[PDB]
């Protein structure tokens, strides 16, 4: 009866910063996954606990579609059981993940000649994120025992850093748009289906 709204995610003009990653909840709709996987276009397309060519035969209770921009270097961190600045402090997948990670080079939308400083990531954090946790705190990071009182200085660092996306960056330092599809199947009713 309803067509799934994944297009809001894949065709969005601008993507979220990874620390403030977007999540769209998909429910009560049908979708044709072959439109997604038969478009080439993807530098990464890896699934866990599901097969892509099987997806059209499946129904799920909900589907989550998380999206954000990270550096090409870092796409390897969007996978179960990883570590690094992205997996630890920005976007973490659980060990028992069932879903697909999808990425494509976005150098020509997301990079700009003098640097696009609009995409950010979290550099400083006291502990690792839980799976699917989203921390948007902008509090000054206290690296010593003296309070920072909202002032940057020694031992007091703004926790987020800007990517510097310039089109001349090496491919590993170029922006990549990532979409993480999660396939949640609680119980009834499974209302997100293939044709």
């Amino acid at each position: 009866t309803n067509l799934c709204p994944f297009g809001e995610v894949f065709n969005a003009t601008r993507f979220a910063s990874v620390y403030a990653w977007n999540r769209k909840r998909i429910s009560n709709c049908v979708a044709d996954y072959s439109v997604l996987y038969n478009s080439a276009s993807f530098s990464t397309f890896k699934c866990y606990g599901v097969s892509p060519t099987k997806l059209n035969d499946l129904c799920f209770t909900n589907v989550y579609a998380d999206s954000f921009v990270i550096r090409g270097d870092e796409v390897r961190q969007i996978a179960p059981g990883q570590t690094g600045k992205i997996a630890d402090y920005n976007y973490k997948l659980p060990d028992d993940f069932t879903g697909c990670v999808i990425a494509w080079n976005s150098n020509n939308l997301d990079s700009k000649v003098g640097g696009n400083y609009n995409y950010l990531y979290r550099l400083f954090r006291k502990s690792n994120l839980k799976p699917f946790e989203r921390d948007i705190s902008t509090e000054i990071y206290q690296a010593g025992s003296t309070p920072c009182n909202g002032v940057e200085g020694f031992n007091c660092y703004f926790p987020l850093q800007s990517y510097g996306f310039q089109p001349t960056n090496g491919v590993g330092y170029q922006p990549y748009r990532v979409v993480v599809l999660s396939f949640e199947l609680l119980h009834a009713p499974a209302t997100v289906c293939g044709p």
Partner: antibody, heavy 116, light 108 residues
Framework: VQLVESGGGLVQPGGSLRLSCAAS????????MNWVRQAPGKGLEWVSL???????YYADSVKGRFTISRDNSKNTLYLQMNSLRAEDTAVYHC???????????WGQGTTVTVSS | EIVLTQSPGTLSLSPGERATLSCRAS???????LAWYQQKPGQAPRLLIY???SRATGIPDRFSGSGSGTDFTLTISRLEPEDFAVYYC????????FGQGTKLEIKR
């Protein structure tokens, strides 16, 4: 603000040692922390990194032999070194890592001599 | 991985002259991670520059950094006697890595 390493000394090949790095003025457990070593008349060699959140990374020359850790109650960073080899002979420094802002605080080091 | 090579191996200059030290990366790299360090004999390294061009707090005005892509430069505009020492550049992949160092020595 200080980092002070200790625990280095003489050890025989195959043996093991534990280095300590006592911080003052930085909180070890809240920082990226590194061990960086320097053999006689050689350059700097990064050896081990520990994240605030606990992830660890190792130089290929020490993987399977070294282990970086810390003790929060003592504000102290450790380097456990097993299966020590002659080429591990060096001054071992600990340093606080700010990544995009470089390694700003360094200790004076502790000397490890691997020899039979 | 990232491999940093410094040039020259030894730089020979006189007080008041201009020193220019080169650091070349084996691969294009982000300028945000490139730091320079000074080491005097028997002493721990001292951070001079971070992010390829930002001075560390307390570092004299004559120390200057620049570059992009694979080619980065430390410039000491007017050498004081205490500037004669070893200098290392550093980059970062998943972990720090160091160039092999340039020795700055007194010309005679």
């Amino acid at each position: 603000v200080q980092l002070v390493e200790s625990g280095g000394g003489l050890v025989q090949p195959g043996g093991s040692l534990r280095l300590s790095c006592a911080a003052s003025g930085i909180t070890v457990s809240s920082n990226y922390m590194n061990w960086v070593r320097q053999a006689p008349g050689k350059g700097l060699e990064w050896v081990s990194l520990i994240y605030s959140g606990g992830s660890t990374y190792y130089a290929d020359s020490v993987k399977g032999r070294f282990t970086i850790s810390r003790d929060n109650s003592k504000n102290t960073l450790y380097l456990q070194m097993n299966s020590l080899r002659a080429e591990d002979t060096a001054v071992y420094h600990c340093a606080r890592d700010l990544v995009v802002y470089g390694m700003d605080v360094w200790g004076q080091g502790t000397t490890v001599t691997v020899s039979s | 991985e990232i491999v940093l090579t410094q040039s020259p191996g030894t730089l020979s200059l006189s007080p008041g002259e201009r020193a220019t030290l080169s650091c070349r990366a084996s691969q294009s790299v982000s300028s945000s991670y490139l730091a320079w360090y000074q080491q005097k004999p028997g002493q721990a390294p001292r951070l001079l520059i971070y992010g390829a061009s930002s001075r560390a707090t307390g570092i004299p005005d004559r120390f200057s950094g620049s570059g992009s892509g694979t080619d980065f430069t430390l410039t000491i505009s007017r050498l004081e006697p205490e500037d004669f020492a070893v200098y290392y550049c550093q980059q970062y992949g998943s972990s720090p890595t160091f160039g092999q160092g340039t020795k700055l020595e007194i010309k005679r």
